[PDB]
Symmetry: C5
Subunit: 311 residues, 5 copies
Amino acid sequence: VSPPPPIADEPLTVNTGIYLIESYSLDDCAETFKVNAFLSLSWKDRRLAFDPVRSGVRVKTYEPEAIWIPEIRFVNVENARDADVVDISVSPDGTVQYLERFSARVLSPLDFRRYPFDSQTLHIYLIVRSVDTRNIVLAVDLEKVGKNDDVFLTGWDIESFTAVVKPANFALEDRLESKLDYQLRISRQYFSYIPNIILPMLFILFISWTAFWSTSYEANVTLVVSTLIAHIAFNILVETNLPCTPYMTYTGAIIFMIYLFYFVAVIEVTVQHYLKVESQPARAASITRASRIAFPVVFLLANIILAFLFF
Amino acid sequence: VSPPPPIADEPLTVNTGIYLIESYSLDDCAETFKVNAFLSLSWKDRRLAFDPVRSGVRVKTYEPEAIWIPEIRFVNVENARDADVVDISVSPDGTVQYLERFSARVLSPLDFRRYPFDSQTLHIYLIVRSVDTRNIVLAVDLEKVGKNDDVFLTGWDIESFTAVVKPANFALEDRLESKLDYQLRISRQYFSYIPNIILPMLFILFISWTAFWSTSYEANVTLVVSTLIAHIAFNILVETNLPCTPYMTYTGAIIFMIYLFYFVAVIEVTVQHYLKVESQPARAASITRASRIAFPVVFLLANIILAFLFF
Amino acid sequence: VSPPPPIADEPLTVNTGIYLIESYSLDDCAETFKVNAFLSLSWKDRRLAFDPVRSGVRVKTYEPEAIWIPEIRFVNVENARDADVVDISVSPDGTVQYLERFSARVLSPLDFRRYPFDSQTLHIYLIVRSVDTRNIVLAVDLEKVGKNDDVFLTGWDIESFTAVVKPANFALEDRLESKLDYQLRISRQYFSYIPNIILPMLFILFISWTAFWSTSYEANVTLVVSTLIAHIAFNILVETNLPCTPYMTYTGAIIFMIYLFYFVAVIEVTVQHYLKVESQPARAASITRASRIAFPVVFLLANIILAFLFF
Amino acid sequence: VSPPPPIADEPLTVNTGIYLIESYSLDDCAETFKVNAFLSLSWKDRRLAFDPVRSGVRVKTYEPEAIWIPEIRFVNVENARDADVVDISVSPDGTVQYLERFSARVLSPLDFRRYPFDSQTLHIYLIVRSVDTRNIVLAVDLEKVGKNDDVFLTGWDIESFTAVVKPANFALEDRLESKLDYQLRISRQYFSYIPNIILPMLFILFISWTAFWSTSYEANVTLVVSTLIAHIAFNILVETNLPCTPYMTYTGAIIFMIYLFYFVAVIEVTVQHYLKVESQPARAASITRASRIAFPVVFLLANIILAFLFF
Amino acid sequence: VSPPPPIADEPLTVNTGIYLIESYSLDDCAETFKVNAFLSLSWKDRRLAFDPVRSGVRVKTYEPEAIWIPEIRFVNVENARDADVVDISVSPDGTVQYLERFSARVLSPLDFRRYPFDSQTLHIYLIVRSVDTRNIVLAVDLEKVGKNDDVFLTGWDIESFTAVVKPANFALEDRLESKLDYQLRISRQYFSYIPNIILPMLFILFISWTAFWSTSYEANVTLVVSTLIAHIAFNILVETNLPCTPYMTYTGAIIFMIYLFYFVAVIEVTVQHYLKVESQPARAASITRASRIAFPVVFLLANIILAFLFF
Ligand SMILES: [Cl-]
Ligand SMILES: [Cl-]
Ligand SMILES: [Cl-]
Ligand SMILES: [Cl-]
Ligand SMILES: [Cl-]
Ligand code: NA
């Protein structure tokens, strides 16, 4: 089999559609997600045309091997789609209607800047390369683009599944490539992060501040160093669920800034003790009394600055 | 091969049955489980009918390629099933009796709200797409739906394996589809969670309460802080075995509430010390004496409420 | 090809044998193990019979596609067996000698009750479904059941590889199934657990008992709490290497009981301090002196009782 | 099919090109990376020559099985590449233009000496083995070597993708082999390591140096030991993300040297206390006062040297 | 196709050779490694013989299906090797020269006794089963056994790749099997273990010994207990990367013995405090002064002894 010939000099229009059946395994570190969907292809092949009245059969059904099917591939897939051909239907006029069910691991980058209050646009790029005979061009049949209502992605809210109707036509290795952009819009469910990471992390920090109502250097050293230790664990815990980035993330900024607070609390605790030993507890008392106010405030303002910069 | 033609205008009824041989790998974080089962299909194809007299055979065996087999797929599978054909038998009226052995990774959501005292309903959805020639409809042959007695799922009690007899017929990509719902009912074996997570977590909390029978600020700070850090370990330990949810979980609620108790115990420990230093240990003594009773009581009440809200 | 016809009304006897070449990957959590073995099949097909005198060839060699081979499957395999056929030999009387080399992931439950002093019986179930023409029955050719001397399973002692000679014949989906039980007997190599888990865990416990020869509450508090946290690590470390069970394990019981000892030691440490503060160190001295004997004695007695219950 | 015949005694030139579509999964520990690219191949087979007048078509399209294709393999791949032929075009003279889309896990060693400020040269080696009939030689068509603009590798900056135009021709197992070297130049994005590992590690170190402004042995022991323990945590965390090397890495050197600082701080803390107990706090005061300066200075000097040695 | 017939009653000699292209993934816990190599096979098949004069070619090239190829398998592989036939060449005297490129996961046990100063001999066992027609025997063509210079195994030094020239012939299920032993000799790169595990572990131990120059029970308790806690981490960290063995390893012995040192240091610290409280610090002073010497000496001696027992 060879491609259908052009009536006039026109490129072949392959109408495409992706219908999500299942979406799963959004790996933040790998910046990948798995998808299970229907891929629909429609093009016209005059060689396959027939008479409806004469033939009696409204539609003719073919096996993939029997007819010419355009070679459609995904740009951003990790491991090549396992495809199932569901049906091939030919109209009297020669309009072919192809439908396959596929599953693929899609590689699509993520913006972690606003984590865990981030939204993402996942991309699925369809591509076709032109043949020497004729040029192939992709189009979106919006009637055949969608998703099942039950499509869920653990820890995410699925906003929309749409296609950018206009293909990106470009030359690559001296042949035309027609690229289509399917978009899955999702927003992270930040709920869990509040009682699991955010609040426990604030409690340990407030506990460190009780050292501002104590004169016991030994108790203070324990309060500040221990609580400090809990933070490293939280800091570490998160890095593990995140890939290295060239920029700072929201949670990353909060976590880093909290380190400075522990460092300064240690300084205060050290200063207060030093003065007490130098028999000047009135200076020490002033610093401790100030810190009670300054820490919470500065900390408070700084977060406002951070949230402002990040959102 | 093409579908069997309708005698009158009727849709083709494909009788289905799933018999579980094995169930394994229930991944809580992935919300998936693996299954190994028999899939039985039965439909009438008059074209294959024969007379037992002239043939001398009560049944006829065919190779899959030789005859028309309805394209049955699973909706909620991750990695498309690997199938083995066990046997294809044709009765004299042309009644086909198909049997395959398959294995598949099924994606079915889980409700973690009552963890680890939760029960789940796992779903296996069978589907068939109608062809242009005729409509294909699924039915359940309850005689061919079951499970082996030895079917086990590690850390779970297998309640039942049943099918919702009435299919969900609907349109998708301008063709009708007949969807069937097979249900595997399971309940979590919470036993382990008691000596592994629950009890150790209560012991560490109760240990923090000995600070209510001590005047030593340094010992108390050590008592609370140390006990506190262990809570974090458990809190983390659990969450790593569980996915992010938009709602609170029973264990999650208990764990979060326990953080508040440590926070308040730190406050009491701080308050008691402050008063002792301000040369007013009679006030301090009252608060500490109240704490010995209030903490346990409030804890008992709050837990009651939580269990009430969750069950 | 169709099954060999019965001379009289007899079922077809397929003689089976499994010869282990390799055993590996015993996953405790998954309750699975991987196996690489020879599968031998032997049955009589009279249609294949010949003359040795005139043919000049004692044995005739066939390709799988050329002859009828019984469909033998494994009941308990996690995933698809790679199968490669080494040889098919036909004796003059028509006795077929099939030999394949396979590899499979077998799912077989484990009893963790006596961990790490447990022994297990791994099962490999062979099965054959009877055809409409004739009934197929499995048999064990003990001559062709064995294992290579070099077969090893990391962290386990391989006791025996035997077959239960009598098949389990039963009806399933209105046809006879013939099931065979191959058994791999193994016992865990508990050596490592002594210097890695058991002894370190006892040392930390004994270190907490030094608090019985100290009057320093702050010191005692530190001893007991610090030692305590290490136990959680061991407790935690261990449980991660295990699946959740509906029962208590030996190690699990020891670990849980040790928590009670820390809890009571904290109580004693608290009591001793309280009395010392209430200016009654003679009562405190009696309790501490009793504790020095009592803890070890009880601990020892408790351990004996448990061992008794578990073995 | 056999190789095309020489027209003089010349070896067959297979022109090659690799165009990266996707690069992902750079595993530092495994020293591997996954790639998804186009493999272009061009050779001349005069046996495929045709007159466009007779055939109708200016360019002929063949299926891989139909014609002779040079056996091109990758030297440094983990499992055999996943390949799909995009197109096979033949021009009238018999010039074949082969295009396949492949994905492979490439094993290429990494130099960790400058981690996390290291750059790497990833290699992809193409190879062809000569036949007894004629010798096959590889060449680079620079017009068909490149990468998509959107090619990204998480945590890395992609510098260049080039080919060493001159093949490495050599004898192996009494036949000629033509090897080509494709190079992917990348440099690590060290940003994250600063707020995640480097800075937290320095803060904890400086927290320990506050022991130089304290006379409390008990507080100092807590400061130095506690802070010390966190270092082990960071030290360990880092090791996990790196493989064993026969050399010392930049981060590894910093981490190791920091251990010495804790060891010496413990000595100072011990010395200071010993003198204080021996009723000679004036000597102790001198050492502590020196330490306040020497530690930071020495540390600083040492880092410059190492920084210097490594770069 | 059938095997080449014997001229006299001789067994068929299949000359073998393995040439390593790549070595990777040495999994210590799994006791496996992955290999990518050339497998060369050579045997005489007289039926394939020809005259160079008549034929006009001095070599004949066949496709695998066309001729009889001996069924060579690997004994110790996890899954059946991924093989691609590179070439099949026939000399005029019926000498067949087969070449395939394969990749396989080899299961070969490791001796951890001297870890991390251990050397290993990895085995690759080639095997052939004799047919009813004739007996097959393996031989090593040393000219075709080798490895690429660039072959590396992360964290290991590759010593040699050789073959035991004499096969192990034996009966298995009443057929002769010819087994060959290919050996890959490797020695572990212990470098990393010194600054990563060994030295940090000695530093924490030495820090615990500073308790011998302190009278502060509370300070001492903190020193020993804290440091002890670091030891568990190292002990735990190590055991995670190593399988359970029925014998002690070198590192395992050092780690275990160090536990005894902490246990005895706790006893000394307890004893010293007890005497101090009983108003007898002169006895306490003697024990502490002895400990300063006895601990280091004993420790030193014990390792010498151990080093001796292990090497
Ligand atoms: Cl694709
Ligand atoms: Cl499916
Ligand atoms: Cl099977
Ligand atoms: Cl390859
Ligand atoms: Cl093999
Ligand atoms: Na302390």
